[PDB]
Design a protein around this ligand. Sequence first.
Ligand SMILES: [Mg+2]
Ligand SMILES: [Mg+2]
Lengths: 245, 245
Amino acid sequence: SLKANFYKNRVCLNVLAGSVDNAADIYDAAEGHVLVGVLSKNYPDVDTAVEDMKKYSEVTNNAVSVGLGAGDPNQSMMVSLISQHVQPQHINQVFTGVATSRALAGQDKSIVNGLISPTGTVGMVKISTGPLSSRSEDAIVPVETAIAMLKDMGGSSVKYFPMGGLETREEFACVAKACADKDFWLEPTGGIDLENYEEIMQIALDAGVSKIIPHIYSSIIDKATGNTRPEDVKTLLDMTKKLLL
Amino acid sequence: SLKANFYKNRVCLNVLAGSVDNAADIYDAAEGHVLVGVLSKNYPDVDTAVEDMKKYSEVTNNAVSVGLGAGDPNQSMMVSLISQHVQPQHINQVFTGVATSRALAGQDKSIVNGLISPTGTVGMVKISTGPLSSRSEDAIVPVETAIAMLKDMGGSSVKYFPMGGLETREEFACVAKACADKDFWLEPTGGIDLENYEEIMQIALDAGVSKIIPHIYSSIIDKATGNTRPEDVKTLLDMTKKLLL
Ligand SMILES: [Mg+2]
Ligand SMILES: [Mg+2]
């Protein structure tokens, strides 16, 4: 079960689970059109992570997204090694970890995203997002080339982060158009909430992006419990059904 | 046997072999301080290349370097799949193939190089050297960050190509400095001949690069036979001993 369940073959929500029970409720709320994020940084080692994420898999039909955790690029290798055993539907990586994860996954079905970042210049993206490279002078390249490199490395989609706000909408619209033109998928991430979901998504849909995996994290998480609100997952589904007629 | 035999733990020559017998002669002439390059493009498929490359490994104590051939990035995946089965001392890769080769090699002992190129601008390097990315607008980045990304991707060394011999002296000197400062290895490649070998190596040596693998191809190949001249290999070895005395 390696193929994510995109709604209308177009959109798959990606949200964090606070617990195995929370993952079950999110999966029901989304009618299965979702990927439940579980973060490697919440585990002391690969084996513990693997053992726990299998429990998430059992209640979501393997709709699990393995993530780095706290944006920490030093988690990249652990994510690759967990994913090799978990065989998830989705893997988050940094630019320098895309090829590793695809090689260790050993098949072409798992979605492997790659972190690239806005720069303040429409059409240019930052690709130095790895453990050591994230701390060097920025690597800034044409967004078309970034996508070609990600494709060369076995990547499935661009994870564009931090989305920020209105200041990066122009930059975002240009990344979405580049994705559509290179037939590549897109994963908007950062600051998405119930009030801006429709607008952001419409940009990617108008650009003609084929498959879109929006990441919606803290805006729908109850900080008292660490759980994603299932009622908010249902709202996102409703809005996604509306966006697509 | 996966460790290249560096002369004085500093320099190992990389030269092409025209035949298994040529490889034996080359290995003797360099007193073992060599890697013998066999090119993926010279073979019809992975299995045919793997069988032949094993014969070169026998006569050289596995001092084999799997190459792309003809500077073609479309040989990248084949080099990775070949190296997986050959387990050579040295693998040549384009930037987007470094991580894949490291992953499918399955150990950290094989040297995996990454191709980055001069740009005309001291301190900036071109890294879009993969199959699709080579056809895209250039990705030009700071040499420091390219080395950091190569490390992040499991690489051992920078392959700086095409150098045009001493035509890119000043760009090369800055790459050697960056390699020395980030403690990364360097493989000068393109236009090296017996008359400029010393001056080119002295640049990387004065910069304090810890391990250098110079690639000397056409200038020492007998065009009548296609064989690399063992007497030229011995000349390069003696020059190397004199450089480090
Ligand atoms: Mg010796
Ligand atoms: Mg000359």
